[PDB]
Amino acid sequence: NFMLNQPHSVSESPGKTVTISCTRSSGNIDSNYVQWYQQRPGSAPITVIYEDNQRPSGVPDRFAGSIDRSSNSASLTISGLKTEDEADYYCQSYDARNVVFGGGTRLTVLGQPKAAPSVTLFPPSSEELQANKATLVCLISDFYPGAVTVAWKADSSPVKAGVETTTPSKQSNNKYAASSYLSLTPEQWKSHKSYSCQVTHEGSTVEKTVAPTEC
Amino acid sequence: NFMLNQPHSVSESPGKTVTISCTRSSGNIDSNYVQWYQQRPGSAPITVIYEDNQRPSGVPDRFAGSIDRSSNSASLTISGLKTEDEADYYCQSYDARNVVFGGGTRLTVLGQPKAAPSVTLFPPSSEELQANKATLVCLISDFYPGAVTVAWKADSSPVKAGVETTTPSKQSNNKYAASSYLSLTPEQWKSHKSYSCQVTHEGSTVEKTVAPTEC
């Protein structure tokens, strides 16, 4: 029985080097190989290091593994830190009685550039109108930081019912996406001239407008 | 290197028994040790099984590993389900040439009644087309448990490139919502007879399709 101790969190700025340590509680670090895994929001982990210092193919050469016998530890060193490196990192070794994981280190990359959202408003599809539904969707993507406010309008008037906005989640570009959907009946959709989605990010507002088709 | 195929999700109420299968694509399951890792949401991984059926210290006997040579599969069975069992489970093996991980199974210990998603597929909006964008949105709402997998087809062929799926978030009705979007160019959109969004939830798969029209 041994455990692997790693910091719960570390922070660093783009282009700088960050190190994550993983201390083995009992026995020598060098007696068993160490793996490192990266995990991003909402996805399975990938392997970034195995056998202490080997990178699988696909893994940026900015990732380096090492062992320090005299602090009985393993380290993951990420140089030229990119925004995309923001993730959880787990160290892993073996007890022959077990596969042992460290507790995970959340790596925060500070000072990531602000990014205004792309907003696309979709009117109701034919299929859903045929099933007596007129849900509108406002796709909001590629924004940072991951907080927005969404308001809807029926013509010029504020919409007070039937809005849902998803919790922004980080996508592969390390920027956020959400959808806001307004669950109208067909009669509400066709009784108005238009509906608008209004997205405010970092005190900037984007408003899109859709209207019942001439079809 | 072979694949390990696991179901996307499983769910049961507390005190029930659930089994998670992991099928080896080629070679013999018994050629190589199968490990099972548990990852509770927001936690580090933990080994629950190694060497097909060995439980590490502290893993209760409610967890059982097995092999079926005839089906070339490994199974993890969890009896007397507890809420702390809610986790992703991954099987793992090797052929020396490399470590192979299964894709993970989400195990929900049911906290509320199951709810099949409403799935709505939106074709490109006029305004985004004028911006040379043919992004499609697949809106997925009112579902429980909060685990879905989304696959996109161009005609009949799977699409990988350009797919982003948001992490499911709990809406005002205590059910989950998510969206998947496929960043097409108008070129790609118009060059196919149709695009489909396939949503899998609890082993039911629904598929919506949209096709370029005009008016």
Ligand SMILES: CCN(CC)c1ccc2c(C)c(CCNC(=O)NCc3cccnc3)c(=O)oc2c1
């Ligand atoms: C939770 C138990 N662990 C140990 C930390 C897991 C569990 C699973 C894996 C898998 C699947 C792979 C193989 C590569 N990973 C992978 O493809 N993950 C999904 C993904 C896909 C594309 C981009 N980012 C993530 C992998 O390399 O490592 C894994 C580690």
